[PDB]
Amino acid sequence: IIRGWIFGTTLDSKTQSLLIVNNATNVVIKVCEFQFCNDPFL
Amino acid sequence: DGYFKIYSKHTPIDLPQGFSALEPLVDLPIGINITRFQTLLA
Amino acid sequence: SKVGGNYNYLYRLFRKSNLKPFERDISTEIYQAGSTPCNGVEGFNCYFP
Numbered sequence: 001i002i003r004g005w006i007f008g009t010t011l012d013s014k015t016q017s018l019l020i021v022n023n024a025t026n027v028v029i030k031v032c033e034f035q036f037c038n039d040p041f042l
Numbered sequence: 043d044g045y046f047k048i049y050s051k052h053t054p055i056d057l058p059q060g061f062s063a064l065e066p067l068v069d070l071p072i073g074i075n076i077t078r079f080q081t082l083l084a
Numbered sequence: 085s086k087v088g089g090n091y092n093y094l095y096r097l098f099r100k101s102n103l104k105p106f107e108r109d110i111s112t113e114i115y116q117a118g119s120t121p122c123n124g125v126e127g128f129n130c131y132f133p
């Protein structure tokens with residue numbers, strides 16, 4: 001049920017954030033300038 | 043110092059008793075600023 | 085170097101606080117330098133970093 005985490009200071013597109021996730025097939029680590037949802041899920 | 047160090051461990055069987063020490067997993071050179079985090083649930 | 089000037093190399097001139105070791109900052113937000121609000125606009129108080 002627990003899949004990963006997101007780290008940062010502001011979770012909008014104005015700064016960089018780290019995304020660690022393990023979907024059904026792959027674990028993906030990315031450090032990009034994401035725009036995140038209020039309630040992100042899978 | 044711009045690194046993201048992770049220590050993890052798994053153990054077969056409300057926080058339980060015992061003593062188990064986590065071993066190093068990875069140290070990622072992301073070089074960003076972190077002050078918040080959130081969990082992803084499926 | 086090129087004749088007439090090469091403008092492909094940039095650097096940051098304004099920032100609110102000092103960096104930490106091995107920390108990268110690739111933001112592009114306008115810098116406030118007079119305590120007067122400036123939302124994107126520039127001039128007499130605010131500069132492109």
Ligand SMILES: *[C@@H]1O[C@H](CO)[C@@H](O)[C@H](O)[C@H]1NC(C)=O
Pocket residue numbers: 009010075076077101102103104
């Ligand atoms: C990291 O972020 C916090 C809040 O977003 C900020 O106060 C701090 O200055 C940032 N780090 C540095 C080195 O400035």
